[PDB]
Structure 1
């Protein structure tokens, strides 16, 4: 046995690398086939079987390759004596080699046996409703009047009025309503309608337009595009003022084609167009008309209308009907589709069937129209954003998906690929920005800069993403009808709700193909009765985790968890006084979010963060006392872009030299002991090159002496875009020192950041965009035009002490935004400045709470 064992063991190691490379190349083949098959439309159960099988074989080979490389690195870590001497290593490594050969031959026979896989040169092989009347439209009366108003206002220029939203949001219904208002007839000689959609031809559109202006299109079918444009221009000139309806135009070229047909007769014509692309709407009109959201009562009224015509919904179905109405998120088409499923089912058994879940019920049966309706644009997304989109589907339904969390989740799953001059963080931020541009992913929260802060995936879109991923298996959500498991073995990843986590753990989960663990707290901070054994068994179940993201728990650094070298992105919480060195073995790691409940003032990062080349972002809820890099660790600049909640002690010349590419840096502690010359730890910030954000927080309320912004501070932080001061109690004279930042973009004064009865700024802020003052005790302000020449946003919250916003800021042309939150009499001056700007008729916004 041992003779034979060692014989085959030695024989195999001689092709382990060749077997590895051949398996990897053939798995690349199968992955290319898999992309092809995903693109293809399929209807044969055998084809779904084969796609399932190739996906599972591909992911099995991926696990084998990652295991082999991880073992190789582990061996290289061991000393030469423990390298040669180890015999268990020999057994495991050759068992791994044997598995790799088995899977390689499996891939060889997968390619050879199945004819479908053969390489092909270029071979992938790929109507409205009834029409409502005014009484059938719901809650659009105010919207219709607003849009018609916008249309009718006299303006010699050809102004556009676009309507934009999400798939099946009712836009075409708003246009059809608008299209049949007598007011529109009064204001315009001839209103004509046209539908474009994603697929169209201009000549079709131009011919249909011409039909309205003459019935002899048979004569002009021989005219060219520009001749037709001139003809229609003359026809309109004869007609007079005209409004043209455009249903679902998604391309700028189309708009720029439509401007042509309108003559320059200074009649102030109009074109109102529907577009699922917010950017297209924005170009069409500089101020869009985002289709409102139906309120739950309106949705219930619509469902009543549909599943019972005009006869009232019967009494007992009202409860269930109400339930169905609210759950649809406020988009009419979800109501429409579930009503379709409910047509003529006055028996409450089926109403209860449909209610119990009303997101799955769309995308089923023949009248699934929601699916294809959304797909009308998903295919309008490139593959990179296709995938980055689908991974918005992990977050629980109704969850608020943070911008940074989702950005690092994308970048931690390997979905994004590097570009030739950009950084993965900004490529991903652009991907999500664009995802909102296409209205694909709701965005209701705006950073001071105006960037995404919380994006949600609409209930209908949530179920669409979940089911689409499940079909592609990129991830999945575990469910349990009382008992059972829904085949999680067909789940490349598992998203588990905390409530069912204990039960899923009771079955002793154990998976290898799994490559992440998602368990978010939609009900924030509802940490259930999870024992340490639960966390240990979690560590056991998923050994190949790239993405271990769980924050509603008391996590611990079990030995098993310490072995997870494949780790990429960690979101854990508990009571940790210092990061153990075990984190120094997670070479694959790219991100680390830390939220510790420890009473310790500082967290000691024992793990050598410097050696982790793949590392990109470390986040801590409390200041981190990072060890400086040693001589051995000296090398290339670290990949670290974001380093949040840094202890000032851990800001040394060597650390900042090792993180010169650091972008987002936050430091909290004692400041005066950090601001002096011998406190040049601040002077050490010169090491940071691409630094952009800097949060300064003082943990002491009783300060020995008030610090002073060093004169070098102007250039010490020259690269910083965002700069938040918290509990700094700086003299407003120091605000002048803050006026010498060339690249200052955002400015937050939080918790008496600046101490003083009144603020009289002098230095101009040639680029500042957002001013943010929170809980400022200073009573009067005399900021002038020169101070903030390019003010675009000014936020002052909890200003119970401030007296009046200076009128001088009214002159600022750039300034359009002004929010006063829990502010004193200065609210009156906000009204005065708003009135002045309205008299000047400058686009400006004023928000007052409550």
Structure 2
């Protein structure tokens, strides 16, 4: 190739300038339509330049793949390269014209250039009676030390309303000499906060205005000492510095002073109190009651509007702020037509209107985010509203979208995990599913937060939901990525879509396993529509590997399903592929990975729903260690010395098959596991129910997986004496036995698991269990489920200090022993939780 490399480089520099401008404009608040048009044009120009460069790189790589004879004799390559160079030159001319003509594209040194409601009467507050009672009981408990009870929750959940309800409660007056309210806020000055606190004790604050912060703290402490027990309410705390400053205004008189603070941050609340108070969500009934109180005040709802109102209140997610905004939409419109209109799209009516109260309140928390976490938050709105987002899937989508910039000491997966946990801690992501590690398993976006992400991503052109009003298309040409539900897929494809600029295609099955009437021609049309697609995350389909699919060389993420007997060699030409998630309905016991994954240097995660029969690297493929981090459902046959050596950086590994033929001496494929350097999770599964002999844990197993933190055994059918071998694992932290992993009437462990935190037993047909303290010194969780034959969980566990959680699911008489242990620990007054189902 000639000068086109220099043209590419110059275009990249200019596009870097344009992207810097776009990042800057994302900060600038704009009310000008011409500014909006210019930013749209620059975004489109950046996208076009990126697509052109990517096409050029792909063509150069494909040419270099071809042999020298084919390289010379391919005139079609010459025509394509000339066309791509012409396109690059045109885009570069456009970018230069953009920068030259517009004075807004001039760089500037430092120049980006950027009250509560009426007052609720105690009957205007809905559903907070029990919550207020709980917080009041916590506040009025006698204790010598200062105690902070933080009320924490998502924006507009009612933290300030509950704090005001408690602050006005008569009960507090009997217990506390002084009950003061202080508003801190995000932007606050501690001198002002202390002066406001001082007003509650002296009316001569015009005398103390000249004092310093510490002097004012001492003055307030003396006043409180003169008074007695005091409760100071801090509103809207966004830093720990406030908590630390306020600790200094309370005298050490052992009276039991209190602070009730409200915050959106769970980490700040956990600093304030190891047990922060999570404000509840209103029930649908309470939501409807609040809606009726907001719309009709004290008058009852008209009968004809009750059904619509109940529908509307249930669509607000139980967050009072949403109900208040929707009420503002329904105020003074007792007509059924207006209520039907609002019911049709309630989340839209949040963030619209001047009373868009959701927008500014959500933006309070949003602006507090770092840029990477900000962008990662928006891509949570790529899932359907109400979708139970898998944490692993969203993490891998963030990484595949380039949202996570690599850091020196952390893997991209670790950074993404931290970002997701930070979003949950800031109460911007709802988490209802916990892994045994204590990490997020599935998360969710609240309807109001989801609508915020959906609008913000559309404003920033990150992605866009394909929504059709009977016919028509809504500008799909104004979106880098497209999300479409399976119901709307057929209609969209019937238009014969052709969007080169679209880079990610999302089809999420919220109604799981509702594969609609999509034909192979529709899948081929999907392939045709997006040739530059980087992320293809569509698992509700019967995907087929057409010849057009083999040309999606830009892919970084694929989540597909169908009837695949093997991964074709064509997958090996996706040199950008990072995540490969497969779900094959084929009856074949294992999936043949024909693709030479080892030469896919970018590949990090491979997920298959049946065991994968990998191929050992050839002598040519030898080189550096592979980037692979996850290898799920790998057949024991494929765990060879070379396979494991190339993937020595593997972190999660799952094996399923004939384990017996894997734990033997000449079966040292198990011994090949030593090649791994950072193996954290290991799943060992057995498929056969009839066993020639009961397998055995090799004596080498202790140091074969010494780095493993999570170990899962399934259908292994091991003698309970074989569990003693797992105690020699130094890093074993979470341990799972499921589906008759260990066989035997009783388990009498002797070895102690030095670091085990979570013990997990499922469907264990054992009868008795005589563990002791030495066996699990640092146990923290004990999850037994489907243990219909277990007799009694040993009392010896009751003496374990760190143990504070234990769940018995579908458990026999052993439940009674769990009650006995709970009773003993309650007698000792140790924080403990015991869950029983049903």
TM-score surpassing 0.5? yes
- Secondary structure, counterpart of 1:161 in structure 2: strand
What are the superposed Cα offsets for residues 43-83 of structure 1, whole Å, 9 maximum, x if unpaired?
Answer: 00111101100000001000000000010000000000000
Aligned residue runs from structure 1 range 584-599, under 5 A: 584-599=572-587
Match of 1:516 among 504, 529, 534: 504
How far residue 42 of structure 1 moved from its aligned partner, in angstroms, is 0.5
Q: Which residue of 1 aligns with 2:54?
A: 66
- Alpha-carbon separation, structure 1, partners of 2:742 and 2:360: 55
Match of 1:206 among 194, 200, 205: 194
How far residue 740 of structure 1 moved from its aligned partner, in angstroms, is 0.8
Match of 1:833 among 821, 825, 829: 821
How far residue 449 of structure 1 moved from its aligned partner, in angstroms, is 1.1
What are the superposed Cα offsets for residues 733-775 of structure 1, whole Å, 9 maximum, x if unpaired?
Answer: 1011111110001111111000000010010011000000000
What are the superposed Cα offsets for residues 347-404 of structure 1, whole Å, 9 maximum, x if unpaired?
Answer: 1111111110101110011100101100001011000100111100100000000010
What are the superposed Cα offsets for residues 764-806 of structure 1, whole Å, 9 maximum, x if unpaired?
Answer: 0110000000000000000100000000011000000100000
Any gaps of 5 or more consecutive residues in structure 1? Answer: 1-13
Q: Which residue of 2 aligns with 1:261?
A: 249
How far residue 18 of structure 1 moved from its aligned partner, in angstroms, is 1.3
- Alpha-carbon separation, structure 1, partners of 2:8 and 2:641: 44
- Alpha-carbon separation, structure 2, partners of 1:755 and 1:38: 61
- Secondary structure, counterpart of 2:341 in structure 1: helix
Is the aligned partner of 1:395 residue 2:383? yes
What are the superposed Cα offsets for residues 795-824 of structure 1, whole Å, 9 maximum, x if unpaired?
Answer: 000000100000000000000000000011
- Alpha-carbon separation, structure 2, partners of 1:645 and 1:578: 14
- Alpha-carbon separation, structure 1, partners of 2:6 and 2:721: 70
How far residue 316 of structure 1 moved from its aligned partner, in angstroms, is 0.7
How far residue 672 of structure 1 moved from its aligned partner, in angstroms, is 1.0
How far residue 105 of structure 1 moved from its aligned partner, in angstroms, is 0.5
- Alpha-carbon separation, structure 2, partners of 1:212 and 1:684: 72
- Alpha-carbon separation, structure 2, partners of 1:828 and 1:44: 69
- Alpha-carbon separation, structure 1, partners of 2:367 and 2:293: 33
- Alpha-carbon separation, structure 2, partners of 1:197 and 1:78: 64
- Secondary structure, counterpart of 1:667 in structure 2: strand
- Alpha-carbon separation, structure 1, partners of 2:210 and 2:526: 71
Q: Which residue of 2 aligns with 1:33?
A: 21
- Alpha-carbon separation, structure 1, partners of 2:216 and 2:661: 76
- Secondary structure, counterpart of 2:537 in structure 1: strand
- Alpha-carbon separation, structure 2, partners of 1:253 and 1:751: 50
- Alpha-carbon separation, structure 1, partners of 2:66 and 2:767: 65
How far residue 19 of structure 1 moved from its aligned partner, in angstroms, is 1.0
- Alpha-carbon separation, structure 1, partners of 2:294 and 2:363: 25
- Secondary structure, counterpart of 2:736 in structure 1: strand
What are the superposed Cα offsets for residues 688-724 of structure 1, whole Å, 9 maximum, x if unpaired?
Answer: 1100111111110001110000000000010111111
Q: Which residue of 2 aligns with 1:3?
A: none
- Alpha-carbon separation, structure 1, partners of 2:313 and 2:381: 23
What are the superposed Cα offsets for residues 269-312 of structure 1, whole Å, 9 maximum, x if unpaired?
Answer: 00010011000001101101000110000000000001001110
How far residue 15 of structure 1 moved from its aligned partner, in angstroms, is 2.5
- Secondary structure, counterpart of 1:513 in structure 2: coil
What are the superposed Cα offsets for residues 123-166 of structure 1, whole Å, 9 maximum, x if unpaired?
Answer: 01111000101100001000000000000000100011000000
- Secondary structure, counterpart of 1:527 in structure 2: coil
- Alpha-carbon separation, structure 2, partners of 1:105 and 1:243: 67
- Alpha-carbon separation, structure 1, partners of 2:592 and 2:466: 36
What are the superposed Cα offsets for residues 70-119 of structure 1, whole Å, 9 maximum, x if unpaired?
Answer: 10000000000000110001001110000000000100000000110101
Q: TM-score, normalised by structure 2?
A: 1.00
- Alpha-carbon separation, structure 2, partners of 1:440 and 1:76: 47
- Secondary structure, counterpart of 2:349 in structure 1: coil
- Alpha-carbon separation, structure 1, partners of 2:295 and 2:218: 49
What are the superposed Cα offsets for residues 574-601 of structure 1, whole Å, 9 maximum, x if unpaired?
Answer: 0000100000000010000010000000
- Alpha-carbon separation, structure 2, partners of 1:191 and 1:131: 18
How far residue 197 of structure 1 moved from its aligned partner, in angstroms, is 1.3
Q: Which runs of 4+ in 1 moved over 4 A?
A: none
- Alpha-carbon separation, structure 2, partners of 1:493 and 1:361: 25
- Alpha-carbon separation, structure 1, partners of 2:107 and 2:65: 42
Q: Which residue of 2 aligns with 1:434?
A: 422
- Alpha-carbon separation, structure 2, partners of 1:718 and 1:567: 35
- Alpha-carbon separation, structure 1, partners of 2:622 and 2:5: 31
- Secondary structure, counterpart of 1:229 in structure 2: helix
How far residue 610 of structure 1 moved from its aligned partner, in angstroms, is 0.1
- Secondary structure, counterpart of 1:162 in structure 2: strand
What are the superposed Cα offsets for residues 531-573 of structure 1, whole Å, 9 maximum, x if unpaired?
Answer: 0000000000001010000000000111100111100010000
What are the superposed Cα offsets for residues 508-536 of structure 1, whole Å, 9 maximum, x if unpaired?
Answer: 00011100100010000000000000000
Aligned residue runs from structure 1 range 146-295, under 5 A: 146-295=134-283
- Secondary structure, counterpart of 2:818 in structure 1: helix
- Secondary structure, counterpart of 1:619 in structure 2: strand
- Secondary structure, counterpart of 2:145 in structure 1: coil
What are the superposed Cα offsets for residues 169-209 of structure 1, whole Å, 9 maximum, x if unpaired?
Answer: 11100000000001000000011001111111101100000
- Secondary structure, counterpart of 2:117 in structure 1: coil
Q: Which residue of 1 aligns with 2:323?
A: 335
- Alpha-carbon separation, structure 1, partners of 2:118 and 2:350: 20
- Alpha-carbon separation, structure 2, partners of 1:740 and 1:844: 29
Match of 1:83 among 71, 91, 99: 71
- Alpha-carbon separation, structure 2, partners of 1:290 and 1:36: 37
Match of 2:761 among 761, 766, 773: 773
- Alpha-carbon separation, structure 2, partners of 1:736 and 1:36: 60
- Alpha-carbon separation, structure 1, partners of 2:463 and 2:78: 34
- Secondary structure, counterpart of 1:39 in structure 2: coil
Bigger Cα displacement from structure 2, 733-742 vs 828-837: 733-742
Q: Which residue of 2 aligns with 1:620?
A: 608
Q: Which residue of 2 aligns with 1:299?
A: 287
Any gaps of 5 or more consecutive residues in structure 2? Answer: none
How far residue 420 of structure 1 moved from its aligned partner, in angstroms, is 1.2
Q: Which residue of 2 aligns with 1:725?
A: 713
- Alpha-carbon separation, structure 2, partners of 1:579 and 1:572: 11
- Secondary structure, counterpart of 1:592 in structure 2: strand
- Alpha-carbon separation, structure 2, partners of 1:478 and 1:127: 38
- Alpha-carbon separation, structure 1, partners of 2:599 and 2:73: 27
Is the aligned partner of 1:378 residue 2:348? no
How far residue 422 of structure 1 moved from its aligned partner, in angstroms, is 0.8
How far residue 17 of structure 1 moved from its aligned partner, in angstroms, is 1.2
How far residue 450 of structure 1 moved from its aligned partner, in angstroms, is 1.0
- Secondary structure, counterpart of 2:613 in structure 1: strand
- Secondary structure, counterpart of 1:119 in structure 2: coil
What are the superposed Cα offsets for residues 595-643 of structure 1, whole Å, 9 maximum, x if unpaired?
Answer: 0000000111000000000000000000000000000000000000000
- Secondary structure, counterpart of 2:200 in structure 1: helix
- Alpha-carbon separation, structure 1, partners of 2:394 and 2:6: 38
Coordinate RMSD, CA, aligned = 0.5
- Alpha-carbon separation, structure 2, partners of 1:449 and 1:616: 22
- Secondary structure, counterpart of 2:338 in structure 1: helix
Q: TM-score, normalised by structure 1?
A: 0.98
- Secondary structure, counterpart of 1:245 in structure 2: strand
- Alpha-carbon separation, structure 1, partners of 2:263 and 2:270: 10
- Alpha-carbon separation, structure 1, partners of 2:823 and 2:40: 64
